[PDB]
Structure 1
């Protein structure tokens, strides 16, 4: 049921160095390491366990862009990177220059993607996010999402990837246009936690639940709490949002995964 079997700390993956944001896009254009390194530091300070790294749209060679991002981040910060790209060569390139164990974001449930990405994760000893979806699209029901989760689990195992290295992403969509999905995603999280011992982990790009909605911060933090209750292990999230991190810390306590103390908000942040 909802009593968590594990005590593992919740994994916060800072979402902010992503070329979708103008300041990151322009730093990449100008090859200016300053905005990159500032955001790496700010997120580290706020307590991120990993830093997401996404080139964004570029006409530049994604391989060079990724190597660059990864090295300039890890120069000023000791944190592993969550390498976020649809380009396997870009991912492998970041992995070759990465210090420590990385996370790969992501592979789909498409067979040819699994076939490429899983070997990469084993070879480099990286964690890997599988998304529940394939070229037929992202499913609606929890039952259809769970079916793709099982397929991801099977392939991961067959490539010799430990379940503690595998993070399944149910794909949260915005509540305004997508509303009915948010509860199906919650149930999928619950089901994934059942699929093996030890169980696969679970992750969400969290901010997607609110994209283009009126009070983003309130919706984001409400849903993170719901997802954590359902069994969520990790989120790509804005770690710069103090209210959001406050909510996660409070939920982690109420879940009995860390011993309560009056200082728990501060303690949660230092891990």
Structure 2
């Protein structure tokens, strides 16, 4: 049921080094490392376990941009990167320069993606995020999404990837334009945690639940608590949003995953 089997620390993947934001995008354009480095530091200090790295829309060679981003980050912080790209050569270039064990963001359940990314994860001992979708489109239902999760699991397994290395992303969509999905995504998270022993892990791109809604921060933290209750293991999220992290910390203590003390808000951040 809802009593978690494990007590692994919730994995926070800082979202901020993503060329969808203008500051990163203009850092990349200028080849200016300072914003990248400042954000790397800031997210590390706030408790991030991994840093998401996304080139954003560029007409430059994504391979060189990813390499630069990964080396620039890891020059100033001792964290691993969650390499976030639609381009597999870009991911592979990042993996070759990366120090320590990375995370790949992401493969879809599309056979020819799975066929490309899972060998990569295996080759470079990276974790890998699988998204519950494919070209047929956005799955509707928890049943749909769970079918794709099983497929991901079966492929991961056939490549020899441990379940501890595989993070299924059940695809949260914004609650204003796609409200009904949010509760289907909670039920998917719950079902994913049943599909193997050890279980696959689960992750969300959290800030998607609120894109273009009012009070994003309230919506983000409310859903993060719901999803953690459902069995979520990781999120790509705004680790600079102290209310958010305070909510996750509080949820993690309430799920008896870390032993209470009065300074748990600080402790959770150190773990």
TM-score class, shorter-chain normalisation, is over 0.9
**If the length of structure 2 is used for normalisation, what is the TM-score?**
1.00
Q: Secondary structure at the match of 1:180?
A: helix
- Counterpart CA distance in 2 for 1:61 and 1:173 is 30
1:38-89 CA-partner distances (Å, limit 9, x unpaired): 0000000000000000000000000000000000000000000000000000
**1:261, CA displacement in angstroms?**
0.3
1:214-241 CA-partner distances (Å, limit 9, x unpaired): 1100000000000000000000000000
- Counterpart CA distance in 2 for 1:193 and 1:39 is 33
Segments of 4+ moved more than 6 angstroms: none
1:139-193 CA-partner distances (Å, limit 9, x unpaired): 1100000000000000000000000000000000000001000000000000000
- Counterpart CA distance in 2 for 1:53 and 1:12 is 14
**1:138, CA displacement in angstroms?**
1.6
Q: Secondary structure at the match of 2:15?
A: strand
- Counterpart CA distance in 2 for 1:177 and 1:8 is 33
**1:259, CA displacement in angstroms?**
0.2
Q: Which runs of 5+ in 1 are unaligned?
A: none
- Counterpart CA distance in 1 for 2:219 and 2:131 is 22
Match in the other structure for 1:237: 237
RMSD over equivalenced CA pairs, Å:
0.2
- Counterpart CA distance in 1 for 2:25 and 2:177 is 27
Q: Secondary structure at the match of 1:239?
A: coil
- Counterpart CA distance in 2 for 1:139 and 1:92 is 28
Count of matched residue pairs: 271
- Counterpart CA distance in 2 for 1:10 and 1:110 is 28
1:84-110 CA-partner distances (Å, limit 9, x unpaired): 000000000000000000000000000
Q: Secondary structure at the match of 1:99?
A: coil
Residues 80-229 of structure 1 correspond to what in structure 2 (within 5 A)? 80-229=80-229
- Counterpart CA distance in 2 for 1:265 and 1:35 is 27
- Counterpart CA distance in 2 for 1:91 and 1:204 is 19
Q: Which runs of 5+ in 2 are unaligned?
A: none
